[PDB]
Amino acid sequence: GMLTKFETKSARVKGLSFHPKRPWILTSLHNGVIQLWDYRMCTLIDKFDEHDGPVRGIDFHKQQPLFVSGGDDYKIKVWNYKLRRCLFTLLGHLDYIRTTFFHHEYPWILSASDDQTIRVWNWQSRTCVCVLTGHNHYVMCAQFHPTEDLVVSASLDQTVRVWDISGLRKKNLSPTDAVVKHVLEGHDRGVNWAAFHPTMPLIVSGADDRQVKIWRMNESKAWEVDTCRGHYNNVSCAVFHPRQELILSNSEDKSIRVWDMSKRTGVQTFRRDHDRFWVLAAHPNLNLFAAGHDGGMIVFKLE
């Protein structure tokens, strides 16, 4: 089932990010440390210790020599991994930052916070260019769509939201800005994570109801199309397998679960003795995955 490639022992891992080309993964830790690992040479390349308290937000830029971090200190830091330093800090959030991601093309950062806001930042102007309001509890996750001007967010308010930011794109990149397109209701507890499918109009979410839910959107509406049961504690994270009909989830129940979207195979469950899982990453072009837990990180393949 699970082919372990690389493991770290560390403070609890809260964030993960695979480099698209280098055999590198970032881990952002509960102790405020960001580790840069080479999983082919089995070495710690570098350590970045500038935050105070947990760092949950971490993302490599897919094309620029940058990564972005978001901390419980309410700071977003933009880093250059060649220069090995923090270029600048973005302030504005009023509570813990849950996620930070770079846009794949636009000069943007997307952040989600316990302050109930989603923020878009322009990293060229080094400014906040949009505050997305509407959630009425912690925003646990916000992600950019890979090819459309959409955002998906997950909140402890029990909703997943889909936002149209095409207005913000036209305003901000030119030489309302953000509209809520869908409010996805169905989880009956706080939602910890939501993500877009790379190609289909699908969303996956994981919640404190111990459910992994799959949603479909069309031109008019969005609706729940499946619910995966088996986790016996809060679902921390869920990702679409980028290139196979699979979903990967992990949980405070100390398990990774692999779901068959085709439903041909039953769910595969991978357990740790003592470690809650907090985060899951998929490599953007390899059949390679990473999970963050109480005792460190595991990088693995499926067989």
UniProtKB/Swiss-Prot annotation:
Entry comment describing in which tissues the protein is expressed: Uniformly expressed in a wide range of adult and fetal tissues. Xenin is found in gastric, duodenal and jejunal mucosa. Circulates in the blood. Seems to be confined to specific endocrine cells.
A GO MF term: mRNA binding
Modified residues (Phosphoserine): S174
WD repeats: 4-39, 43-81, 85-123, 127-165, 178-217, 224-261, 265-302
Cysteine pairs bridged by disulfides in the record: none
Primary location class: cytoplasm
Any one GO CC term of the record: cytoplasm
Keywords on record: Cytoplasm, Cytoplasmic vesicle, Disease variant, ER-Golgi transport, Golgi apparatus, Hormone, Membrane, Methylation, Phosphoprotein, Protein transport, Repeat, Secreted, Transport, WD repeat
GO biological process: endoplasmic reticulum to Golgi vesicle-mediated transport; intra-Golgi vesicle-mediated transport; intracellular protein transport; pancreatic juice secretion; protein localization to axon; protein localization to cell leading edge; retrograde vesicle-mediated transport, Golgi to endoplasmic reticulum
Keyword Repeat included in the entry's annotation: yes
Location within or outside the cell: Cytoplasm; Golgi apparatus membrane; Cytoplasmic vesicle, COPI-coated vesicle membrane
Phenotype for E224K: In AIAISD; causes a defect in retrograde transport from the Golgi to the endoplasmic reticulum
Transmembrane feature ranges: none
Biological function: The coatomer is a cytosolic protein complex that binds to dilysine motifs and reversibly associates with Golgi non-clathrin-coated vesicles, which further mediate biosynthetic protein transport from the ER, via the Golgi up to the trans Golgi network. Coatomer complex is required for budding from Golgi membranes, and is essential for the retrograde Golgi-to-ER transport of dilysine-tagged proteins.
Disorder cited: Autoinflammation and autoimmunity, systemic, with immune dysregulation: An autoinflammatory disorder with systemic manifestations. Clinical features include inflammatory arthritis, interstitial lung disease, alveolar hemorrhage, neuromyelitis optica, and immune complex-mediated renal disease. AIAISD inheritance is autosomal dominant with incomplete penetrance.
Subunit structure: Oligomeric complex that consists of at least the alpha, beta, beta', gamma, delta, epsilon and zeta subunits. Interacts with SCYL1. Interacts with JAGN1. Interacts with TMEM41B. Interacts with SVEP1. Probably interacts with PEX11A.
Protein name, entry field: Coatomer subunit alpha
